Amino acid sequence: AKETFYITTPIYYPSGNLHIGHAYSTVAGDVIARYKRMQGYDVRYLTGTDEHGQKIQEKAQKAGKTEIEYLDEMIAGIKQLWAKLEISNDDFIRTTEERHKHVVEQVFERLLKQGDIYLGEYEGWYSVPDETYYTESQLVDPQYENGKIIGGKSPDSGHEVELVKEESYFFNISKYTDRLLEFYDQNPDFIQPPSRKNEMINNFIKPGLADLAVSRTSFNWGVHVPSNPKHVVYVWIDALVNYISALGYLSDDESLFNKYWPADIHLMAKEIVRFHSIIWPILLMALDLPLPKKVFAHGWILMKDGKMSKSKGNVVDPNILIDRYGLDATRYYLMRELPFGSDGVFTPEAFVERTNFDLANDLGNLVNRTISMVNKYFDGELPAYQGPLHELDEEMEAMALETVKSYTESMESLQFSVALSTVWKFISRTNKYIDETTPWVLAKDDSQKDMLGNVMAHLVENIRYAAVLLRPFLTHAPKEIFEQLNINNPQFMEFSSLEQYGVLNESIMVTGQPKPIFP
Numbered sequence: 001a002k003e004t005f006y007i008t009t010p011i012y013y014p015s016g017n018l019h020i021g022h023a024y025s026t027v028a029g030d031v032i033a034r035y036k037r038m039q040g041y042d043v044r045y046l047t048g049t050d051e052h053g054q055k056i057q058e059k060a061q062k063a064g065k066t067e068i069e070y071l072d073e074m075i076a077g078i079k080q081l082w083a084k085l086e087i088s089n090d091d092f093i094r095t096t097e098e099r100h101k102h103v104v105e106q107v108f109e110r111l112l113k114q115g116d117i118y119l120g121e122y123e124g125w126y127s128v129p130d131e132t133y134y135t136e137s138q139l140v141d142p143q144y145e146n147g148k149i150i151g152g153k154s155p156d157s158g159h160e161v162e163l164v165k166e167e168s169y170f171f172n173i174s175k176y177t178d179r180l181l182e183f184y185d186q187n188p189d190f191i192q193p194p195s196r197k198n199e200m201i202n203n204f205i206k207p208g209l210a211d212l213a214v215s216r217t218s219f220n221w222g223v224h225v226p227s228n229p230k231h232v233v234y235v236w237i238d239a240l241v242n243y244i245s246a247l248g249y250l251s252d253d254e255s256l257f258n259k260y261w262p263a264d265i266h267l268m269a270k271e272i273v274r275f276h277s278i279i280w281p282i283l284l285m286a287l288d289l290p291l292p293k294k295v296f297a298h299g300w301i302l303m304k305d306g307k308m309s310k311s312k313g314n315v316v317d318p319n320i321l322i323d324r325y326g327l328d329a330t331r332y333y334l335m336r337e338l339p340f341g342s343d344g345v346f347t348p349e350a351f352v353e354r355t356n357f358d359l360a361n362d363l364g365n366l367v368n369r370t371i372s373m374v375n376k377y378f379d380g381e382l383p384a385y386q387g388p389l390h391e392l393d394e395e396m397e398a399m400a401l402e403t404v405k406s407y408t409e410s411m412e413s414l415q416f417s418v419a420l421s422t423v424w425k426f427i428s429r430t431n432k433y434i435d436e437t438t439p440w441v442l443a444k445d446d447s448q449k450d451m452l453g454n455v456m457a458h459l460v461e462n463i464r465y466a467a468v469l470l471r472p473f474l475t476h477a478p479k480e481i482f483e484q485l486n487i488n489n490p491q492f493m494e495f496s497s498l499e500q501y502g503v504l505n506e507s508i509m510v511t512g513q514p515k516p517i518f519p
C-alpha cells in the first residue's frame, strides 16, 4: 500500500487581495505535493482561509456587506487564483465552515473541562496604524504614573497606543515547556531551516511562556465559546485547528484524520513559525494528539525596502504575471529565483531575464533545434537509442544519472532553486552537445548516418529526462514536450523511467509541425 503524505499551507487572511507572497507558499506546497505523488505517495494537500476577527468585520462594513458576503467574494477570487496557478490542492478549508467551527468549539470546551483554560482579563496596548497589540514592555517612550505604565508609543510606527482591557480566557501553555523542548531534542528536523530554532527559543521560550489569551469579548465575528457565547475564540485555537478540522477530526467521519494526521510538513513564512512550533504542538499535547513531523518556514519576497504585504500595498499580483508571461513562467520564477529559506527582492527585470533565458531560450531552443533536425535529417523518424556511440556519450549519460540523483537530494531537503539549477546545468549541457557534435556536418556524409541518429537519440533522451524532472514545477511544458516528441508511453513520463538511460529503443515519429514550448 501507498504511504500517506500530508502537506499544508497557512490559511490566508482575506483582509485584502493575495499577492505573489501567497502564491510562493502555495506553489511551493504544490511542487512538493506533485513530487510526492510522482514518488508513489498517497498525498493530501490542504490550503484555506482564516476568516474571523475584527479586521474582517471592519472590511465587510466598509464595503457595505455582511461578513459572509464579503468573505464568499474574497474566497471565490482566491479559489480562482489557485485554479489559474493549477494548484493540486485536495481541499480548501474555510474557518466559517461548520466542520471547522465544530472542532474549535469542542477543543475549547475540552480545554475548559481539563482546566487548561481559565477565565481572566486580557490587558494590552493597541496601535491603530499598526493594527497590532503590544505588551507594556514593548512600548517606546513609556509614560509613568506612580510607577505604572499608563501610555507609550508603538515600537514599529511610533504612534501613540491605547490601553485595552477585556474579559478573556487564558490557556496555561507553560506546563508543556519541558515536553515541547524534549520533542525538539528527539526530532532534530522538526524546525526547518534549523537556523530558525535558536532565535525562536531564545526570544519566546527562554523567558517563560506566558498564559495565552485565547478568547476575546470586544467583538462578535468569531467562533463563539458554546458555554460562554459573549466570548469568541481568538486566532490561536481558531486558525491552528484548520489542519485537523479539514480532516474531519471530532466529526462523524474521522477517516481522513485517521489516515493522514500527523502532517508531514506545515509550510509558512518565518513570521508565523513560532506559532506553529510552540503554540500548535502544545495545543496538540492538550488534545493528546500526534505532533506534526516538520514545520518549514521559508523567507520573504521583498519589495520597496520591505516584506511584500497586502496591508502596505507594495505588491505584485500573480494574476498579472500569469496573464502577461504565462503560467509556467510564473511558477518557474517563484521556485527558482528565491532560494527556499532566504529572503529576496522581486524585480520585473529579474523575472523576464529568468524566464526568457532559462525557459524560452535554453529549454525552448533545445527542443526546437532537436525536433527540426529530426524532421530535416530523418523525415520525422527518430532513430532508436542503441548505446553511447559518440566519444562524449558515456560522460553525458553519467551526467544524466547524476542530475537525477542530485535533483532528488535537493528536492528531499526542499532546496527547490538548487534542484532547478541542477536540471538547467543538464539542459545547458545538451545545447552544448549540439555545438560539439555539429549534426549538420554529420548529415553531409552518408557513412555518418548512424552516428547522426545516435546524436539525435541522445538529444531527445536528455530532453525526456528534463521534462520528467520538471513535472512537479511546470504543469504545461512537460506535456507539450512529450506531445511534440510523440512519446506516448506513460511509463516514460515517470521517475522510475530515469533509472537507466536510453529507454527509446523503438523508432518514433516526432511532430511534423513543431511550435515553441513557451509561453
Ligand SMILES: N=C(NCCCCNC(=N)NC(=N)Nc1ccc(Cl)cc1)NC(=N)Nc1ccc(Cl)cc1
Pocket: 013, 050, 051, 052, 053, 054, 055, 221, 222, 223, 232, 233, 234, 235, 236, 238, 239, 240, 272, 275, 276
Ligand atoms: N502577529 C500576530 N499576532 C496575533 C494577533 C493576530 C490578529 N490579526 C490577524 N490577522 N488575525 C488572524 N489572522 N486571524 C484571526 C482569527 C480569529 C479571530 Cl477571532 C481573530 C483573528 N498574528 C498574525 N499576524 N497571524 C497569525 C496567523 C496564524 C496564526 Cl496560527 C497565528 C497568528
Ligand SMILES: N=C(NCCCCNC(=N)NC(=N)Nc1ccc(Cl)cc1)NC(=N)Nc1ccc(Cl)cc1
Pocket: 177, 178, 181, 182, 184, 185, 198, 201, 202, 205, 206
Ligand atoms: N539555545 C537553546 N536551545 C535549546 C536547548 C535544548 C532544549 N532541550 C531541553 N532538554 N531543555 C530543557 N529541558 N530545559 C533547559 C533549561 C535551561 C537550560 Cl541551561 C537548558 C535547557 N537554549 C538556551 N540557550 N537556553 C534555554 C534556557 C531555558 C529554557 Cl526553558 C530553554 C532554553
Ligand SMILES: Nc1ncnc2c1ncn2[C@@H]1O[C@H](COP(=O)(O)OP(=O)(O)OP(=O)(O)O)[C@@H](O)[C@H]1O
Pocket: 010, 012, 013, 015, 020, 021, 022, 024, 025, 267, 268, 269, 270, 271, 272, 299, 300, 301, 302, 307, 308, 309, 310, 311, 312
Ligand atoms: N512577502 C511574502 N513572502 C513569502 N511568503 C509570504 C509573503 N506574504 C505572505 N506570504 C505567505 O502567506 C502567509 C501569511 O502572510 P500574510 O498574509 O500575513 O502577509 P501579508 O500579505 O503581509 O498580510 P498582512 O498585511 O495582513 O500582514 C505567510 O506565512 C506566507 O506563507
